[PDB]
């Protein structure tokens, strides 16, 4: 797409993947992050839209592992352009996701994530006929202590470990080196990796594997019972606790409660809160921030502003 | 030594006052060669210190809680400009996480990067942040020496803190030397010069004070038209010998349209993008 | 435009070179003719001991450019065209820097080795000129002539100055 294709492309509630990169720069391997989100567990309508916004010449010899998805553009750009950014309407989209191939090229723990930064810090400080600021972003960032860049209405220190900094529990950043204890979970209990890989992957089975090992690209079918009863799995969602069927139960009453009427009438098997960051204070605040609690004890109380993670079935 | 050494020679310029403000380096290299011996030749008002500004415990010792300002110096021979103002704007936006109000002048190698700092929601130039662009004010004052020549070592030589050189040959460096004397300064205007046309008080303070006064904050204006008369509170921006001479300008009471001609708001002339090959 | 001062001394063979000189002293600067990037590291110190400076140098070199043009040109990347209004129009209604001929009537025969600050006097409330300095040529001091063209840079004279015919005038003069 040219800006003006884009712009008048009424493109909302889609996925924008910001992409530093370059002829030189190694593939990131963008399949793993399309094939998740394309899933048959979604409706066709219920698919999110996605658009690559970097360098053309970069996406060109990595496209052809992603030429057989559906709802997918690029826009030849720059993630640093607010006019790029306009085109794409960031404003609008359920996810801006920041990644950088340019990892590898210099070392000097400063030089390896200024791209990123500039690009969160661009994005937060937008204006739209409200501020940027609200706009959900996820950074990848090669070195876990610049973490600290992201925020500012945080507290930061260089001997924290990365999972009790304020962005990295807000869900706002990812680094890869939260994955170097997988390796000793994986060790104490081989069946681990079976069910991250099976929850994360949009459940790629071992028969997925072959099929791609001998073609090296996804081959398409045509449809038969089996075909169709293999979409009769459950997805991870987010519930709004302001909807009729929860609301009431919302007012400070128990997850318990909600977790129990949840499951045995819709099998949908909540398993934590993301709660708003001052959701505990007396005061109100403009914070639109919201934090991570995973298996909340039972006796716990439900804010009527809390989104519940959940586990849905097909239909 | 390229980078500090002019600098230094100002700052602790023996004209302007015998004052003691700046007293603090931080670098994450080593002080080595002759470069030590530049500190050695200012011992009470120096101090170097090891340590990197990326780093909020080397920002909590040199104490950039009641630091005043900071002053960030770019590579200027760096090999590439873009690196170098991303990695100047990464020092910016560590010093103000750690610290909101601290004042920060910092050195641009290329034009747009100011866009980024004006991102950081800390920043404010209605409170004396500000950036340098080399390349904006290099070809700038090539520019403007394109329309009038040696308008650029003009400019140059009114930031520059120099005292007058007395010179007894009838040379041109003895006028020269003269003119190279005054800088640039700015007072507020006395109340005695308030309702009246800006070119009568040029005349005024020039002929009764000896003060060339140039532009006034209307927000910021330079040689303002005769219709312009001065209201209460002005700054008003003067050539002068020195400070202490500038004071006077306050002190003084009597005594002794179908087509797109323009950019969008008129500065600057346009026209529709042409194509490389029409102008070869 | 040159990468390393020092350099300088080689740009002028009438002049007198010396490897200690500062380049603000030297012939092809005071002239105009050089310019090096180093002479802007004073603008640090300059700007710290007062904030106004970087500000009024902005407006006199950049052309005017104001904080809604830096928004404009942050979002767009490229200058964007408009269409014609008063207000775009009463915009123009600057100064610009100019050089004056003192060899041209309404000034020349005050060019004789009359007083600069008359000549600033009569400019001032008859144009709205103001003139700041003289570009004078580097021998018009010798009692022989010379074929030497080179000029160099007076600052704010001290009034009682002698006005060579030869001399122009540098000025700020308003649009119409
Ligand atoms: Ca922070
Ligand atoms: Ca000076
Ligand atoms: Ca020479």
Redesign the pocket.
Known sequence: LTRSEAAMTVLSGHVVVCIFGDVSSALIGLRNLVMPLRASNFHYHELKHIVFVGSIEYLKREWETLHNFPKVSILPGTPLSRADLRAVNINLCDMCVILSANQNNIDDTSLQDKECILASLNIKSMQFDTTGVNIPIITELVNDTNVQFLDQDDDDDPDTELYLTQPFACGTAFAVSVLDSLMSATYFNDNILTLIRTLVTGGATPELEALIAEENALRGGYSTPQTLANRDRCRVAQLALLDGPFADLGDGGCYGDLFCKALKTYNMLCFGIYRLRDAHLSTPSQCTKRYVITNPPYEFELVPTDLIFCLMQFD | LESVSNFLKDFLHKDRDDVNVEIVFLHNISPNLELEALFKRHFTQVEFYQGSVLNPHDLARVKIESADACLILANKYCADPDAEDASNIMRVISIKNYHPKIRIITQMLQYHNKAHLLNIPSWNWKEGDDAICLAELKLGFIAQSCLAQGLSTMLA??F???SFIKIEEDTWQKYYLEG????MYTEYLSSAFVGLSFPTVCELCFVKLKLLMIAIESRILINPGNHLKIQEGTLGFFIASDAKEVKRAFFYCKACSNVKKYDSTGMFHWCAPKEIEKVI
């Open positions: 030589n009114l520059s803190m120099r190279v004397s005054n800088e």
